């Protein structure tokens, strides 16, 4: 409805808090700036993304904007770790303060992008028939996306109530009465579960992989110490600025593997109770060491286990077989005491695999599971899924899914060779998933909009990352993400291993504060890296 503009300086894709704090700096900066977003309004995944028990991972102290200081004093977070809907009213909240709507055309998806070698600028179609010219393209599009695979056969003939937690209905879903079924138990599976357990007759919960997921013990945020608190945001966020993961998470001095069993069971039950992501970090060697992985992971399968009063049950549940928080770690909120009551049912379907989606609810090999209700709590593609679903063209009509195929190419996650005046908010080749999601946003989006400051400044409209220092870049983070667990995770590799041909690891794992030198080093020798003319 709003009308995207014919010209701009920049064009955001994407609304989230990726594409709102481009638009706001490069407002602030003096340059003429227009997002685009699929999406009716602001937020991102916390606008698509509704399903009941969607919370973050982090807490609500680390997990926000810091560029404003009126934002940072006017805003309560109410619990330790934010709910979704707090989320998004946060979000709306920023919007709203900085009358940032008016910068974006929401409800419209851009279908392609092509680079102009004469001009040095992006001619960008939107599915609207909307084209824009924009001399930098910036792409917020985000890390998480709805994968691209049919669904389970005969999905379509469930005669029952059917969700997916990936557009879940605006208004409350009451499953008062109802035999219900969740399919999935990654993030949103883990999340949503115990929520349906509470008004559910019945609820089964059909488990392919076991995940590992933590307590979050989450609590209401003392109003006493968020003021105090308030009174020193600055530093305090400054002090997250200056840690491998953006947050104040202790750095755990010792070898997993260099303590008695004892203090072992005291460190990490002590973490236990507590609760959070901060485990991650009670050793220093948990994302490094094959066997010192292991001890921590033997640790949390006993404490599902324990858990767990149906022994049966509880070694279904037990994830085995690979590393212990090589992805973003799971807080849940008494999903395992959840198989405890009456009412809830493990159905393993490694061992019973899904035949079928039926009228009557779900056929594996073993049985039929009528259900009222069907849940679908769905993953997410790959970090490049966003992007790889635009027709993106770069120097001789290149596409960037042709050259990213093995893998994205990248000088500090930031821009690709051969693709000039486009740049990456918080993707492939930087630290990203692995942090603080917020805090890398900002170091980028600060980077990014800085970056064209200068161009301006100095007179120049055409940036393209140097292709030797891009592939000392890969290399780079190639080699050492090997030195991790993280390379035993399939999904940070874009396609399986092929002997003779080049295999590039997603995100940089050398820690968020490394990066920022990094990248601080570029700029102040005046990019470093980068062609600009
Ligand atoms: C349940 C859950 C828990 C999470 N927990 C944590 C946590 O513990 N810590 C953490 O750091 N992060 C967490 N996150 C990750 C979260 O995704 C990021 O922190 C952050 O919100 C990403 O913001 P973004 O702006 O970069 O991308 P997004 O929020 O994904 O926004 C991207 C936007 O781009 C739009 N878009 C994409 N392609 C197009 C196109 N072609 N045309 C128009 N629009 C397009 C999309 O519609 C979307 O609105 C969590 C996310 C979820 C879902």
């Not at 594409?19 to 699929?38: D, F, K, N, P, Q």
């Not at 919960?205 to 020193?232: C, W």
């Not at 009528?370 to 790959?382: H, I, K, M, Q």
């Not at 504060?513 to 570029?522: A, G, M, N, S, T």
């Amino acid at each position: 409805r709003r009308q995207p503009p014919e010209e701009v300086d920049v064009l955001v894709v994407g609304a989230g808090f990726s594409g709102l704090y481009a638009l706001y700096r490069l407002r602030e900066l003096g340059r003429s700036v227009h997002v685009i977003e699929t999406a009716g309004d602001v937020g991102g995944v916390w606008y698509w993304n509704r399903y009941p028990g969607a919370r973050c991972d982090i807490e609500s102290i680390e997990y926000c904007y810091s560029f404003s200081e009126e934002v940072l004093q006017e805003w309560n977070w109410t619990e330790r770790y934010a709910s979704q809907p707090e989320i998004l009213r946060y979000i709306n909240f920023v919007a709203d303060k900085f009358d940032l709507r008016s910068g974006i055309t929401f409800h419209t998806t851009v279908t392609a992008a092509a680079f102009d070698e004469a001009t040095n600028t992006w001619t960008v179609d939107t599915n609207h028939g909307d084209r824009i010219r924009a001399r930098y393209l910036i792409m917020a599009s985000g890390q998480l996306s709805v994968p691209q695979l049919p669904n389970f056969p005969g999905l379509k003939d469930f005669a029952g109530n059917l969700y997916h937690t990936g557009n879940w209905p605006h208004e409350p879903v009451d499953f008062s009465g109802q035999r219900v079924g969740v399919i999935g138990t990654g993030s949103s599976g883990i999340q949503v579960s115990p929520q349906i357990a509470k008004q559910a007759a019945e609820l089964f919960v059909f488990q392919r992989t076991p995940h590992f997921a933590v307590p979050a013990r989450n609590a209401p945020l003392d109003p006493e110490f968020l003021a105090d608190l308030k009174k020193r945001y600055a530093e305090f966020r400054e002090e997250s600025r200056n840690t491998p993961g953006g947050t104040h998470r202790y750095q755990g001095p010792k070898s997993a593997l260099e303590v008695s069993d004892e203090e072992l069971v005291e460190t990490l039950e002590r973490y236990w109770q507590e609760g959070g992501p901060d485990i991650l970090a009670a050793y220093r060697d948990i994302l490094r060491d094959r066997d010192a992985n292991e001890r921590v992971a033997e640790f949390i399968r006993n404490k599902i286990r324990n858990t767990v009063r149906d022994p049966e049950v509880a070694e279904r549940l037990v994830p085995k077989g690979y590393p212990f928080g090589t992805k973003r770690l799971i807080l849940e909120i008494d999903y395992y005491e959840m198989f405890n009551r009456d009412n809830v049912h493990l159905v393993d379907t490694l061992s019973a695999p899904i035949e079928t989606i039926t009228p009557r609810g779900v056929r594996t090999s073993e049985r039929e599971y009528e259900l009222d209700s069907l849940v679908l709590a769905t993953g997410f593609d790959a970090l490049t899924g966003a992007l790889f679903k635009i027709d993106i063209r770069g120097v001789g009509n290149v596409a960037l899914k042709e050259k990213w195929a093995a893998g994205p190419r990248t000088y500090l996650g930031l821009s690709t060779a051969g693709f000039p005046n486009l740049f990456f908010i918080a993707g492939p080749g930087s630290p990203s998933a692995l942090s603080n999601m917020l805090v890398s946003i900002e170091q980028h989006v600060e980077w990014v909009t800085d970056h064209i400051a200068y161009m301006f400044k100095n007179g120049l409209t055409r940036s393209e990352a140097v292709l030797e220092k891009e592939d000392e870049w890969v290399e780079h983070v190639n080699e050492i993400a090997d030195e991790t667990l993280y390379p035993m995770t399939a999904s940070w590799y874009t396609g399986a291993n092929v002997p003779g041909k080049p295999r590039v690891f997603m995100l940089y794992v050398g820690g968020f504060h490394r990066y920022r030198q990094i990248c601080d080093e570029v700029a102040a020798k005046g990019y470093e890296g980068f062609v600009l003319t």
